[PDB]
Amino acid sequence: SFLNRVCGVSAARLTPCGTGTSTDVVYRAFDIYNDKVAGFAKFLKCRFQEKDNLIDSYFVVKRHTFSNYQHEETIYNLLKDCPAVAKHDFFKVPHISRQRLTKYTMADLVYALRHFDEGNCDTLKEILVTYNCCDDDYFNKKDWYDFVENPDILRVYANLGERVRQALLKTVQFCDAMRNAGIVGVLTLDNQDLNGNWYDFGDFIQPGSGVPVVDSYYSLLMPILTLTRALTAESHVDTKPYIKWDLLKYDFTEERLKLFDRYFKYWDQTYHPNCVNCLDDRCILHCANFNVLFSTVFPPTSFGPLVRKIFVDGVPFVVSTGYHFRELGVVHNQDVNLHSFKELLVYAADPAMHAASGNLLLDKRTTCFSVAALTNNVAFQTVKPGNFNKDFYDFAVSKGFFKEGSSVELKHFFFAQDGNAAISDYDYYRYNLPTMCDIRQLLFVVEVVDKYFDCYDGGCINANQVIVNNLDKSAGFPFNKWGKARLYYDSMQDALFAYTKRNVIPTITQMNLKYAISAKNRARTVAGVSICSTMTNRQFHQKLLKSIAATRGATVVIGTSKFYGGWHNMLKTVYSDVENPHLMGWDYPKCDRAMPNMLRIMASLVLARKHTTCCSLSHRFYRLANECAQVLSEMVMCGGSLYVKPGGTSSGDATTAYANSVFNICQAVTANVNALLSTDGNKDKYVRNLQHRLYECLYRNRDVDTDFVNEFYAYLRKHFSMMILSDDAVVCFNSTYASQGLVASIKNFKSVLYYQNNVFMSEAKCWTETDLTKGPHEFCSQHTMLVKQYVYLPYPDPSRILGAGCFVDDIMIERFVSLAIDAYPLTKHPNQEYADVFHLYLQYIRKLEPEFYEAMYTPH
């Protein structure tokens, strides 16, 4: 009779899914915070299903207390009007019966997409198939989950966009209903089925002055909005033709505000469609997080530099007088004159006239948006093959090398590339997709990363303080035509930097093909950022860069020469103090072509927090806008035609290494945050209190709490050490904690990368060494061997050494001396063939003293 009663007058075609009247525990996701525990994890919870064949619609019954029963009944009776509330049913012991709820709640979907694990990802497959997003047979195509391979997974995911949008609209309706009904409460993901309805009003409070706390909800749900393209239905007229947006329209500010009010009505924080109105860098990040989502509706031709026709001596040009970022909104210059050296420099770098006075182009080889050809015929570039060194190969074979089965064998070669290789390489930018970040979590992580970077000092400097190295380097597209950076630095600069704080200067960068030895035939590219960008980025950052490059014992070891025992000191430092020391590493799949825009902007902002005294807010904002327009969404001249670069790091700017270090530290910190919050707190006391206060500072506080920031920094420095160099890290983490999940494991890094970088990190490309006596397996393409002199030594791969020796490009012995210096530590390797490698080089060098090559490892 219970099954009959649970469905009174609404198509009671149900089938039991539990055990009679007994409840039905399940391993679902939840968001718990009540004065004992706080996090986003899975917990063990009388569910029924409706038969159409069966369809996903369930009657989730519960048993509660009379107090909660009446408390929920009153609020439901006061909220039944809105259509975004799941039809409830109350009767009696108290039983509350929901109706027509989906199998899985939004919380389960978000957790599955944020804690992905191919080993156990059944829930994600079930969700995908249940809503016709794909077909079950799609999962027999192993490697389906990857993003870099099988890009059709994006199409498969995008089938949930309509469901996500409907959920957002119903949530806004529910918030309006509560506010009009005078109910105050907190809004959580785990109380909304995938259809959009709501339930579980057991912790609300009681007209016209209600206020729901909806910060955690949107903050946690944000990442799933750019993944499933929830706002792709806003480009239609109202199954309809695309909106015929006027080509000349570029403001969209009113549309931005309308979208914000339609979907983020109750986000009780000022939103500035133009980020120039922001009060602090935290506000800039908060507003850019929304601009990222809202930029995926408007036509892609609106973005880019905004040009206005100005006149000089009656000669009309077409130059940019602003820019339209997808993140920082519209930005209008300030020192602009409509009538009339540095002027030439700013004007030439502008893509305005270059794209205006060029032939239209439609490249069908790639998918990246094109702009305009700069010539009549496209250009095809080729890469020559290596240059065999007969003498060295004969010398090596004479010494009994390369015998069948020998451990050392050539594996590194100069590979040759055909004509259409540069464009194929550039087309790899298709891996950079829009990404919405958890804004509150990112706002905590930025503070923690700044605390990491607190040991350094710096600020803006003049043109007589910047140190310039490698003056002979490519300048930029219009600039490489007549010289390199040396010519420009020898001509002028301070005013240009001052002007750079009051305007925006878009620039163009060339993407060539590099010619270097590697173990894979994939083409590799080197980009040269325009001189007008590096000139100012140096003045902005060089003090801090040199401060980090000359600091010893820090978390980032950039610039720490491994000679003279440096490796030993670094290894001891990372092994400062850990109860159960271990080691761990990882590799980022396509770091420079997949890291989202928000993380790069955050890194740039963090690197600029040294200017609280030298610069005001507006100057820093225009510096950020310059950086974003110049090294994030720049225009790239690949071949002989211009393309718009969707994102990713620029491999030519001097701040790529340190920005990557900031991004890596942010990834590690967020991995720790997810591991600690996702750890079931109910299962020690200090750690539980620390995670409670971590959750409070993330999703309850609205301002910095320096005390807890310091506490968490110390906690990580103690129980989770790390040694960071751009896109290359080593860890020394308390093994027992990681086993208990109190620090960042490797699956945590996997999931973080999956849901925040749109890539997949293969577990075969990351290692773990449990015996500290043998240090990290691989770091900076180096290996470590514990020898007696007892110290650690860096020894490379013998195959790479032999390959580099055999094939040397055109244009001497210094290369062999360097190889021997890097090869001396092999002498102490247990293997005999490895030891023979160093002697071969020494014997060969004489044909052209081990004490000299030993002196570079005794610390003095």
Binding site: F30, D31, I32, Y33, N34, D35, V184, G185, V186, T188, D203, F204, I205, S209, V211, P212, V213, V214, D215, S216, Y266, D268, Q269, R700, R702, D705, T706, D707
Partner: protein, 74 residues
């Protein structure tokens, strides 16, 4: 089980013309007639009364979570 505000704070007396005791400096949320300005020395301007004959006062520039703590405790 995300609770609104457990272990809610208590009453306090303030000069005028509910506290949130933060170790990094005391901060008053709401002072439970029209009193446009309140003083504590620091001035804290107040919002229009919330009739319910007592009245409640909110400081302009208050988020939607603190209003939950203030209204939930009341």
């Amino acid at each position: 089980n995300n609770e609104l505000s457990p272990v809610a704070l208590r009453q306090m007396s303030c000069a005028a013309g509910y506290y949130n005791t933060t170790k990094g400096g005391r901060f008053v949320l709401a002072l439970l007639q029209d009193l446009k300005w309140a003083r504590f020395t620091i001035y804290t301007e107040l919002e229009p009364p919330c009739r319910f004959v007592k009245y409640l006062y909110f400081i302009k520039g208050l988020n939607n979570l603190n209003r939950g703590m203030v209204l939930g405790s009341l």
